[PDB]
């Protein structure tokens, strides 16, 4: 049993998690550490994860008038800015208004 945090992945034994930006590809063995490969194009993971697939970045729909503040990394999502003429509807940032 047991398992130290940010490592805690336990299945017969204690494996480590994936650093944010990496996703799981193979479990660990009695004598092999976890797999983890870095998140693909358009994808990210901000957690020490035991996840198969990363998530797609936020988008920022221009049909709703959204710019991009920070183009997301494999570690952080895309920071969704609002139009350079329009104010954001709610504390970052789904609907935009005048």
């Amino acid at each position, epitope marked *: 049993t047991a398992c130290r945090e940010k490592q805690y992945l336990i299945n*017969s034994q204690c494996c480590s998690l994936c650093q944010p930006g990496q996703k*799981l*590809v193979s479990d660990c*063995t009695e004598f*092999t550490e976890t797999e983890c*490969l870095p998140c*693909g194009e358009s994808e990210f993971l901000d957690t020490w994860n035991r996840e198969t*697939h990363c998530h*797609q970045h936020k988008y920022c729909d221009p049909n709703l008038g959204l710019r991009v503040q920070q183009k997301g990394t494999s570690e952080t999502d895309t920071i969704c800015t609002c139009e350079e003429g329009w104010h954001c509807t709610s504390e970052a940032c789904e609907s935009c208004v005048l």
Partner: antibody
Amino acid sequence: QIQLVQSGPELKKPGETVRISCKASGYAFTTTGMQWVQEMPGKGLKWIGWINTHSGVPKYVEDFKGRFAFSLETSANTAYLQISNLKNEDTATYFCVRSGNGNYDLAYFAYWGQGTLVTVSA
Amino acid sequence: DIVLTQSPATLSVTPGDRVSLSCRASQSISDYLHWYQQKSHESPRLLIKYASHSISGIPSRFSGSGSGSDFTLSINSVEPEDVGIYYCQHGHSFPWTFGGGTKLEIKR
């Protein structure tokens, strides 16, 4: 190394059933979930779905769901796949697949069985 | 359901050549693409995982590239043994689909 040995070739009349075995060896059977693939004579490959070698919970791809079914005998390191109400369209070669190393999704099939040809005929 | 279009359907190549077998998805499948080699009277063999990553035992020649919608399996110096059918398969969302196959025909 890791090995996937399958059952012999079967012939069944349409509307009957058939079960194909898969005897995994070279690893901890319950650590890695078992999957199944259907190779159509000549034609392409279709992923049937997968089973959890720990919980026993299967995820079947829609077309295959209802007629195809994953069953396993842990004690023997053997996973099975049984096709119910056999259709003529089911005459294909069946493969049990493994990998990655977890009991999750993982589309990369690093380990394949030898194949089991099912023949649906009167 | 994703659609993995593998063109050319067939490809006749002399040995030693550089080869580039293509795979294009309907949606963007990010880096969830895998490559399989199926020789005659043999089960498939995983060559490439997650579009670019090398498989333990696969000859040096084979290498893969690509992201999102267009991917490419490249055989550096085509050998007469590399005669088979090559499949691409995705991971980015249930269910998983394979491709056409690109039959590789060695010239002599």
